Amino acid sequence: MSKITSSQVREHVKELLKYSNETKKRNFLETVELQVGLKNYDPQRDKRFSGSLKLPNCPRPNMSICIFGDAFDVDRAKSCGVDAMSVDDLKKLNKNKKLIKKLSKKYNAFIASEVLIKQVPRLLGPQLSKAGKFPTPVSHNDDLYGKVTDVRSTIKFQLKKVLCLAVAVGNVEMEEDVLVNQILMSVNFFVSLLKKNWQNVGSLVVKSSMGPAFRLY
Amino acid sequence: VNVPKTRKTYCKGKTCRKHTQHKVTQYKAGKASLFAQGKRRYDRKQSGFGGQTKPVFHKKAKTTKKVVLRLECVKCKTRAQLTLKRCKHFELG
Amino acid sequence: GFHNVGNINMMAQQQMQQNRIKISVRNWQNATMNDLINFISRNARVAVYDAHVEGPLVIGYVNSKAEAESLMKWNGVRFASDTISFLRGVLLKRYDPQTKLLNLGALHSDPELIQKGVQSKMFPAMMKLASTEKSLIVESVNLADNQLKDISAISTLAQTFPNLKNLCLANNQIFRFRSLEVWKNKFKDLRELLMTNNPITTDKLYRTEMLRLFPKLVVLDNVIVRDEQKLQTVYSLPMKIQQFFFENDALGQSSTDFATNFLNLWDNNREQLLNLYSPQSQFSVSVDSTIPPSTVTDSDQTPAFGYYMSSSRNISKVSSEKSIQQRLSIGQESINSIFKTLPKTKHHLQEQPNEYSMETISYPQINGFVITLHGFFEETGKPELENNKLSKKSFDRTWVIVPMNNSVIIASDLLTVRAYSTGAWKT
RNA sequence: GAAGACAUUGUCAGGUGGGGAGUUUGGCUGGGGCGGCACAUCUGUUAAACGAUAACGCAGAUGUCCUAAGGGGGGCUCAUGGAGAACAGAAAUCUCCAGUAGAACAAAAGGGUAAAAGCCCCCUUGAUUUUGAUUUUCAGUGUGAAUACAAACCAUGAAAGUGUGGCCUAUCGAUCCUUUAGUCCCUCGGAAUUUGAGGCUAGAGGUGCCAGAAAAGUUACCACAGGGAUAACUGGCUUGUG
RNA sequence: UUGACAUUGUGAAGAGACAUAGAGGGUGUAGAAUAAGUGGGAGCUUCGGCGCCAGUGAAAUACCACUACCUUUAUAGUUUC
RNA sequence: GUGAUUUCUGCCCAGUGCUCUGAAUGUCAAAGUGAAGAAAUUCAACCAAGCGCGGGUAAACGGC
RNA sequence: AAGCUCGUAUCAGUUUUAUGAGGUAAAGCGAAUGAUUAGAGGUUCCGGGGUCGAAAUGACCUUGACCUAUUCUCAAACUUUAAAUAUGUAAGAAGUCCUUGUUACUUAAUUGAACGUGGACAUUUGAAUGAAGAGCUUUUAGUGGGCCAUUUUUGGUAAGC
Ligand SMILES: [Mg+2]
Ligand SMILES: [Mg+2]
Ligand SMILES: [Mg+2]
Ligand SMILES: [Mg+2]
Ligand SMILES: [Mg+2]
Ligand SMILES: [Mg+2]
Ligand SMILES: [Mg+2]
Ligand SMILES: [Mg+2]
Ligand SMILES: [Mg+2]
Ligand SMILES: [Mg+2]
Ligand SMILES: [Mg+2]
Ligand SMILES: [Mg+2]
Ligand SMILES: [Mg+2]
Ligand SMILES: [Mg+2]
Ligand SMILES: [Mg+2]
Ligand SMILES: [Mg+2]
Ligand SMILES: [Mg+2]
Ligand SMILES: [Mg+2]
Ligand SMILES: [Mg+2]
Ligand SMILES: [Mg+2]
């Protein structure tokens, strides 16, 4: 929606950050996600819109991106200390059909080589895109550590058959004003992505991954 | 045709008066009903008995359109317009 | 480009999810697996449904239009590497260790291989299988009349079976020599070859080019084409070598004792070079830049000893006089300078006492005794004086010690950096 | 007796409505019509050695394409032939010699170009702002396209320089009406504030019949105002022999 | 021809849409199983209570996480027919 | 509409018409309803017949 | 038609002298371009498309790609040379020379560029012949169907086409 004097979200973020670790000092699982449900739009009758609105603020540090690439980016991935893959390894992955549906679950994402990604379309077969894990390409001269940071901090709004899109927009760690900036950026991106720029958005909720009863949005 | 969405050109704002950086979008249009003098005149001429009273054009010959770019200054927020030739496919990659 | 035409798509695995999750209680009386496969295919092979029987009288796994139509039709009508585990075992049975050779003839007349219904790339990969066997040792080969006018499938056998000694290939069907022309310096130690009743063996060149094809041949088709009694002493060494020898056995014992003592002391701390050498006992040190043949086993490619080159008193290395005069050894002070010039290295002689090879002798001009030992010297640590560090590198000490009642006193103190490889001690 | 706050009647609104009314039903053209566009444009020829010059003359093109295929700089030489090199066989990769362009430069044709205008790289946005003058068509009007300066701001290059889109010759559009950008802008006339509206300067939305109406047939039942049609004479042809 | 308003007064029953609250539905062949749902979700609870790693699955489960509607109720009202 | 008597008038409802013992929002005007606004207004839902979907009809026009 | 400002101008449907531009006639092709026409096969050297197809070891079609081992042959849309006829400019007083004034332009500069002050140069003041006065302004009529002849040409066997 058109923005609505975000002190209510400020008090909601303060109540959420006093819910996490000040009434339940649990183990380190900080992810203050924003769930947004849209109203007054038909999925089949309207266009299924999508975009990615990558904010550099990060909240999910433990991620799995099995870098699939060639030899030079394999050495670059071994330098960047992340789980890589080889060409014969990916050939065996396309050989065993049950291994792909499991490697899509043991990983959290993916990051491909601008020299082998125009094949993951067919070699690494379907259900990777159905699990929404189509790999993003990385060039022969871009920074692999920076690309891994971007693929860990890149959020994407996609219109499915349901109107209940939720995104890991923040962590419950700290930085109230930076969290307010993140909430403003996410609300701006959703409002600009929807067809009517204000009217369609109905439900906004904050939850710090703990089934907390503090939304107040 | 491909045009990038960033461009350094001259802006004539009173603060800048030099070459600055702009971002690029495409131009579109609107309309108005209980406002404009032409519509308010046409509706009264159209009411009553008499028929249609104005011409109606149905002999279109062009198949394409010129494209206009709107440039917004990042340091001034002063827009500017620039027209291009006739093309069939346009994007801002 | 790369792996492209793997065929993981085009109706094989993708777009196979058009199923319909309805009430699933279809008309189903008898549709089980064996009778279904029999009533579907009595003339060819077929591809079956996902999960379709009539055991529970319910079926909804006909995930396509023609699948659902055939299911409704039979509802409305009443009805009712992997070859390596045998190939390598056959090859290991063919490599009898008693005869020390394998026979690969007449495989196209053996029912264990005729009904298997498979030859050229099979034998060219069977060379790789026989090289990766490594425990079914076979020296010679017996593959007469192998149904080839050329030698394509037996081309890599010369590289894979480099201990060839004989071959019987008679009743051949070859009419050229260019297929055998690649066998120069390849299976050239073999000493018997005959492929008669053929246009490759009944030609003129069979006595002038066969010796070139096998220079080391002590026989030629149940004959002798070379002086095989003298070839063992002319084409090879006349006598063996001695990995440890001296003028006397007790001389070699004391020489090896003082050599191991000096090597252990130089490994622990060489700070007492001034106390090990006298005022006259000088030294020398040099490095070996160039290397031997590239096919030498575990051979250092280049002398990576770039922190010891300035104090190398080598004659033909540097062209100056004052440079070798400054890099050369005076008494105890410059002896300790040469001792701390190079990289300190614990002696790899106690691991391979065999490869630590030491000769010895006496010195009649001073009633002394000399010992030239040579071993490895692997340097974990280096010289603390200011590509940089060492590599796999050897060393050789040619000392000349004159004994007394107390101990022995050195006269020559040599240092030699080299390129490490295998030693001439082993068999 | 029957019916009953429903029908009926009044006003507005949506369908239906050749039963009826009014009107229209392009131009060029070996007659009209069909076909075509010779209706707005470009190259060679017709075209007769300045310029101009017709035909439903001839051979063809246009309503596009390009963030580089625009701008600056650096290095290099193209088509082709010959002699050589394992597999190599018209033809795969490498080496040398010859090579005035026989290649390439988006598209038709003509012109132009070799330490380049071609090919390969590097940096960029001058395809920017403000307005006058000039050339072609020409009434020396408009539209389109182009040329040379001025006043700013930039790019590139060591620099001199060059750069106001595409190496040159084609690639496109008024009034009225909508809409957009810009002016701590002007007006709403009894006086103010805020919406709304109207103006000024510069672009887009289009008229291809391209100086730019909003448009189907038939008449032998026909009407009006006018203009044109009739023996063979080649300024001299016709008879027996492909 | 169809709708609205007016002509136009006096009564009574029924069937429906909107908010507040309550739990129900996620059964195909499979996998114990009641998974065509959406991304968090690896550690929380004497309780191990399912997890990930086991496996079947297309989708796997703790913390019941958000939209829901689809079959369901109860309140008074607005209006309908 | 056909055109005394005699004799024969086959098959197609698909196209265009004409029609309706059929389903339910697909299109859906004024009036009324709701939301935002200082208000003029703007947005949204609901929505009659008709059309559309579905059925009938050839001594209807047609078609073979 | 009405005139107006002036009085032999510096002008010409022309020649001469000087100096440019052109690519037709003729030459020449054979010096590089030398052509339409009916022109035989060589399939994984190309293949344009058109029909089917729960799709690709994918079937069904025909113009043509390329003339392959064919040359003489000639041009209004081919070039090396190149007339005649027709065509642009100049032949001075608004000129030339000497000297030195202005400028915010230009030069390294006291250099130039443009415009000047002062001075010198008329029997010919810069080839011929002619000159019915020269220059300028306002306003308005009719016309906007043409035809014939020599020569040079385009399309139609060709015509008073
Ligand atoms: Mg009206
Ligand atoms: Mg009534
Ligand atoms: Mg009518
Ligand atoms: Mg009429
Ligand atoms: Mg006409
Ligand atoms: Mg005609
Ligand atoms: Mg001319
Ligand atoms: Mg260019
Ligand atoms: Mg003009
Ligand atoms: Mg316009
Ligand atoms: Mg016109
Ligand atoms: Mg016109
Ligand atoms: Mg008449
Ligand atoms: Mg019908
Ligand atoms: Mg309405
Ligand atoms: Mg209706
Ligand atoms: Mg001629
Ligand atoms: Mg003077
Ligand atoms: Mg006139
Ligand atoms: Mg007339």
Q: What is the DSSP string of A54-89?
A: --S----------EE--SHHHHHHHHTT--EE-HHH
Give chain B as a 3 state SS string.
Answer: CECCCEEEEEECCCCCCEEEEEEEEECCCCCCCCCCHHHHHHHHHHCCCCCCCCCCCCCCCCCCEEEEEEEEECCCCCEEEEEEEEECCCECC
Residue C128 region by backbone torsions, left for phi larger than 0, else alpha for psi between -120 and 50, else beta = alpha
Distance, in Å, from the CA atom of C104 to the CA atom of C106, rounded to the nearest integer, reads 7
Q: Do C6 and A125 touch (CB under 8 A)?
A: no
Q: How is chain A split among helix, strand and coil, in percent rounded to 5?
A: 30, 15, 55
The answer to the question of residue C157 being in a domain is yes
Task: Identify whether residues C338 and C350 lie together within a single domain.
Answer: yes
Strand pairing of C101-103 and C140-142?
parallel
First to last CA, chain C: 47
The answer to whether the CB atoms of C2 and A125 lie below 8 A apart is no
Phi, psi of C102 (to 5 degrees): -115, 145
Using CA atoms of A184, A53, A212, A104 in order, give the dihedral in degrees to the nearest 10: 180
For residue C11, give the nearest of A167, A70, A62, A122 by alpha carbon. Answer: A122
From C195's Cα to the closest Cα of chain A, the distance in A is 43
Residue A216 Cα, gap to closest chain C Cα (Å): 39
Q: In sequence order, what are the residues at sequence separation of 6 or more whose Cβ sits closer than 8 angstroms to the Cβ of residue A102?
A: none
Containing C415, the helix (H) or strand (E) segment is strand C414-417
d(CA A64, CA A71): 20
Q: Is the CB of C66 under 7 A from strand G?
A: yes
Residues 3-22 on chain B lying near strand D, CB distance under 7 A: 3-4, 7-10, 12-14, 17-19
Shared domain check, C204 and C253 = no
Q: Is the CB of C10 under 7 A from strand G?
A: yes
Residues C255, C347 share a domain: yes
Resolution in A: 2.6
Distance A46 CA to F44 C1' (A): 18
Among residues A201, A199, A190, A198, which one has the least CA distance to residue A2? A198
Decide if A126 and C3 are in contact by the 8 Å CB cutoff. Answer: no
Q: Are residues C129 and C275 in the same domain?
A: no
Query: What angle (nearest 5°) sits at the alpha carbon of residue C10, between those of residues C7 and C13?
Result: 80
| Same domain assignment for residues C200 and C90 | yes
- Choosing among A73, A94, A104, which should be mutated to test the C contact, i.e. which has the most C CBs within 10 A? A94
Domain-located, residue C138? yes
Picking from C182, C199, C234, the residue at the C-terminal end of a domain is C234
User: Which contacts (CB < 8 Å, 24+ apart) does range B86-91 have?
Assistant: B87/B1, B88/B64, B89/B1, B90/B1, B90/B3, B90/B26, B91/B1, B91/B2, B91/B3
Task: State both tokens at C99.
Answer: 């005869």
Is C32 domain-assigned? Answer: no
C4 in a domain, yes or no?
A: no
Distance (Å) from the alpha carbon of C242 to chain A's nearest alpha carbon? 48
The rounded Å distance from CA B47 to ligand 3 centre is 22
The CA dihedral of C289, C293, C295, C296, to the nearest 10 degrees, is -60
CA of A113, closest CA in chain C: separation in Å?
Answer: 13
φ, ψ dihedrals at A29, nearest 5°: -135, 50
Residue C56 is given by DSSP the state S
The first and second tokens of residue C119, run together, are 């030859």
- Residue pair C363/C258 in contact (Cβ under 8 Å)? The answer is no
Cβ neighbors of C422 (< 8 A, separation 6 or more) are: C296, C297, C298, C355
**Residue C70, CB, less than 7 Å from strand G?**
no
Q: Distance from the CA of B53 to the center of ligand 4, in angstroms?
A: 20
Work out the burial of residue B7: count CB atoms within 10 Å of its CB; fewer than 13 is exposed, 13-18 middle, 19 or more buried.
middle
d(Cα B89, Cα C16) in Å, to the nearest integer? Answer: 36
Whether C92 contacts C133, CB under 8 Å = yes
Q: Which experimental technique did the depositors report for determining this structure?
A: cryo-EM
Q: In what order do the strands lie in the sheet with A164-167?
A: A164-167, A33-38, A201-207
Residues 97-156 of A with CB under 8 A from C: 97, 116, 119, 122-126
Q: Within this chain, do residues C422 and C335 fall inside the same structural domain, yes or no? A: yes
Name the residue with tokens 């004391």: C254
Torsional class of A21: left (φ above 0), alpha (ψ -120 to 50), beta (otherwise): left
C201 and C173, same structural domain? yes
Give the H or E element holding residue C375.
strand C368-378
Contacts with C9 from chain A: Cβ below 8 Å:
122, 125
- Strands B65-73 and B18-26 turn out to be antiparallel
- Give the side-chain half-sphere CA count within 13 A for A117: 15
Q: How many structural domains does chain C have?
A: 2
Q: Give the total residue count for chain C.
A: 427
Domain that holds residue C147: 81-234
Q: Which residue of C has its CA nearest to A86?
A: C3
Cβ-contact A144, A79 below 8 angstroms: yes
- Classify residue C130: in a domain, yes or no: yes
Residues C243 and C227 in one domain: no
The encoded tokens of residue C217 equal 């041949």
- Asked if residue C93 belongs to a domain, the reply is yes
**Residues C3, A97: C-beta atoms closer than 8 Å:** no
What is the CA C25 to C1' D43 distance in angstroms? 78
Q: Find where tokens 């991935």 sit.
A: A77
- Residues in chain A with CB shorter than 8 Å from the CB of C15 are 126
Query: Does A71 reach chain C within 8 Å, measured CB to CB?
Result: no
| Whether residues C282 and C213 fall in one domain | no
H helix runs in C77-152, sequence order: 84-94, 111-114, 122-133
**Touching partners of B (3+ C-beta pairs < 8 Å):** none
Touching subunits of A (3+ CB pairs, under 8 Å) are C
C222 belongs to a structural domain:
yes
**Helix A144-153 crosses helix A72-79 at what angle (to 10 degrees)?**
70
Hey, are the CB atoms on C2 and A119 less than 8 Å from each other? Answer: yes
B63 nearest nucleotide via C1' and CA = D63
Q: Check whether residue C414 and residue C298 sit in a common domain.
A: yes
- Residues C218 and C248 placed together within one structural domain of the fold: no
Query: What nucleotides of chain D have any atom within 7 angstroms of a protein Cβ?
Result: 63-68, 124-130, 152-154, 165-166, 172-173, 177-184, 196-199, 202-209, 213-215
- Considering the domain architecture, whether residues C202 and C225 belong to the same structural domain is answered as yes
Last residue of a domain, one of C183, C210, C234: C234
Domain closes at, from C176, C201, C234? C234
Q: How far is A211 from chain C (nearest CA, A)?
A: 32
Contact A119 C4 (CB under 8 A): yes
Residue C53 falls inside a structural domain: no
